[PDB]
Curated annotation (Swiss-Prot), chain B:
Shown residues within the full chain: 39 to 405 of 593
The protein's annotated pathway: Protein modification; protein ubiquitination
UniProt name for this protein: Regulatory protein NPR1
Effect seen on changing residue 110 to A: Defective interaction with TGA factors (e.g. TGA3) and consequent disruption of transcriptional regulatory activity
Naturally occurring in which organism (per UniProt): Arabidopsis thaliana (Mouse-ear cress)
Impact noted for substituting residue 45 to K: In dim; impaired dimerization and oligomerization leading to increased nuclear accumulation, but lost ability to activate as-1 elements-containing gene promoters (e.g
Motif SIM3, required fo binding to SUMO3 and subsequent sumoylation, residue numbers: 305-308
Biological process terms in GO annotation: defense response to bacterium; defense response to fungus; extracellular ATP signaling; induced systemic resistance; negative regulation of defense response; plant-type hypersensitive response; positive regulation of DNA-templated transcription; protein ubiquitination
Length: 361, 365
């Protein structure tokens, strides 16, 4: 006849119990991440559920090598976390989508619903990349559906990273890739943002589609490009010599935004120590220098900007202030009950505390 | 809100493909049967699904390391009921994919083309083997499933097979209370001889059945003393003692069903000699309602059938349920034993021989 659900759920529960304690059920392989942590797993289960692991295990058994697999070697184009791998392996074992622990897929804004904020998008990106590398089509489709449902609410700067990973996944994520391309074309993303966030192929494709649809594709000023290249090389004296000609201004070139977004901390610091640019100036996307400083999560940049008269009460076109951006850019792990817990870099927490201080000031 | 059926079905399909090709997915253990065949299985799957396998593998890993070096002897951990290979395959398929797999036709099927193979002996034997495997492996879902399978059928099974079903139900402990109680009720309701109970069931089971038969008002006749002497002389294979007991004129082989006893439970040569004495009616019917030819067909020994026919055995007689000796020999033998493929794991061919002898005798009406 058809399917018997009771036996299927019993099988799923037994295999999930196997995954929960793999050492009590004769685990014979280990998957080591790029950080240093490792997860124990069994060769048969993952050789059956995924073709990638079957091929990798058949290749590893040919050298007569307890088998360890470096995740940083097989999947090389995206640094995946630990909880994403745990979720993917839980689905591999029990056919059940295990939810992530609180904090990983959640930001530091208690007002944020954690649906479209950056930590959740990053977790979904990691899980989708893992499902693509492991060649699990159901997980691929499910998480592509998730990102397609949420992408209309995520900010454009994160949609750029979503488009990047969608192109990384090739033809397996056609829907998400085309949707992100359409969203980026319809929006007013700077050419510098596209150049520094996307490979040359994507930039050329988006520019061709923008010029084909008759959209606004303005060229870059040559002298402004010279100032940008001078800033990218950390040559402040070159910026001084370029400004001596008075052909360009740091406000019309958004040199502060560029230095805060992409350049080094010391380069932006030395550029600010000259005082030849409006600190509260905006950009074609509507962000001020403090907003980009919040997006970068560098405490010294925010501090030096506040010591220069940066107004922190100004909002973006979407209604987000610098504190909101800083909270929604950091995950909740870095701001909760003060345990050790990997720690990562407490730079985002420092930025959040700086901006919360400036709030009540 | 609800279980995901597609993901669970894909999981079951993947693990069924694992079971169908264990060596392709790094099998690390081998279950060897009593005959000598091997089934390659993985330790993790059976340690998860079966608590028995987990407890056994935790102790087996104490001693033991090269290439697929873990072996489990089924003849030792079972050691209470000889289990075939197809039933083990079915149980392992349910362990891996959580779905029941029907055995190849012939294991649970008899050689009678008119039989529906619902209650014949091969089907009952396969059900009992799978039930015993589920009991030993500690799987309650399979236990209940096959208990219900046997319970729905037991009312249409011949009582002599109900004896074996009750034996297994007693073996399987309290995990088959319904089956055991129903089988005990069926046995005490019928008029099964005390000798058959003694030779087919343990002492405590026979004592319980006799106690309930006595307390329920049903008659339990006293075992005739001299008949017991004849039965004991036949069981020890002393035809001279049987001759001495018959020389006292106090006994009669027909009144004791000595031919039935010798054909059912004694050796071939003892029954042959007792038949050569020519001191008993060959077509005599026992209290159960069977003739000596029916008992010979149940025993599946061709020499006894030939010696019976050469002595005057009528093959056209039927039992209480309407079965002739040919139909009994058909429904008692597996269908694979009479197939057009003798190299399919050779088995005793005495059943096919008896069936064909009775078919040839039936052709000369
Ligand atoms: Cl809250
Ligand atoms: Cl809000
Ligand atoms: Cl929200
Ligand atoms: Cl962001
Ligand atoms: Cl059997
Ligand atoms: Zn959030
Ligand atoms: Zn049958």
């Amino acid at each position: 006849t058809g399917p018997d659900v009771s036996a299927l759920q019993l099988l799923s529960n037994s295999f999930e119990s196997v995954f929960d304690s793999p050492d009590d059920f004769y685990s014979d392989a280990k998957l080591v991440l790029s950080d240093g942590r490792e997860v124990s797993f069994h060769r048969c289960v993952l050789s059956a559920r995924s073709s990638f692991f079957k091929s990798a295990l058949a290749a590893a058994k040919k050298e007569k090598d307890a088998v360890k697999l470096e995740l940083k070697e097989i999947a090389k184009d995206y640094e995946v976390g630990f909880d994403s791998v745990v979720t993917v392996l839980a689905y591999v074992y029990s056919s059940r989508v295990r939810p992530p622990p609180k904090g990983v897929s959640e930001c530091a804004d208690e007002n944020c619903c954690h649906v479209a904020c950056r930590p959740a998008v990053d977790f979904m990106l990691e899980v989708l990349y893992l499902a693509f590398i492991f060649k699990i089509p159901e997980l691929i489709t499910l998480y592509q559906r998730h990102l397609l449902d949420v992408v209309d609410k995520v900010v454009i700067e994160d949609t750029l990273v979503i488009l990047k990973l969608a192109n990384i996944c090739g033809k397996a994520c056609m829907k998400l890739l085309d949707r992100c391309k359409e969203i980026i074309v319809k929006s007013n993303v700077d050419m510098v943002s596209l150049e520094k966030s996307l490979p040359e192929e994507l930039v050329k494709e988006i520019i061709d589609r923008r010029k084909e649809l008759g959209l606004e594709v303005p060229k870059v000023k040559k002298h402004v490009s010279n100032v940008h290249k001078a800033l990218d090389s950390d040559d402040i004296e070159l910026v001084k010599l370029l400004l001596k000609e008075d052909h360009t201004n740091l406000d019309d070139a958004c040199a502060l935004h560029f230095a805060v977004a992409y350049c080094n901390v010391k380069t932006a610091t030395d550029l600010l120590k000259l005082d030849l640019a409006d600190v509260n100036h905006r950009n074609p996307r509507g962000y001020t220098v403090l907003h980009v400083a919040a997006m970068r999560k560098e405490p010294q940049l925010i501090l030096s900007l506040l010591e220069k008269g940066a107004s922190a009460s100004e909002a973006t076109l979407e209604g987000r202030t610098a504190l909101m951006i800083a909270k929604q850019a950091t995950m909740a792990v870095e701001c909760n009950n003060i345990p050790e817990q990997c720690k990562h870099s407490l730079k985002g927490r420092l930025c959040v505390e700086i901006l919360e201080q400036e709030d009540k000031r």
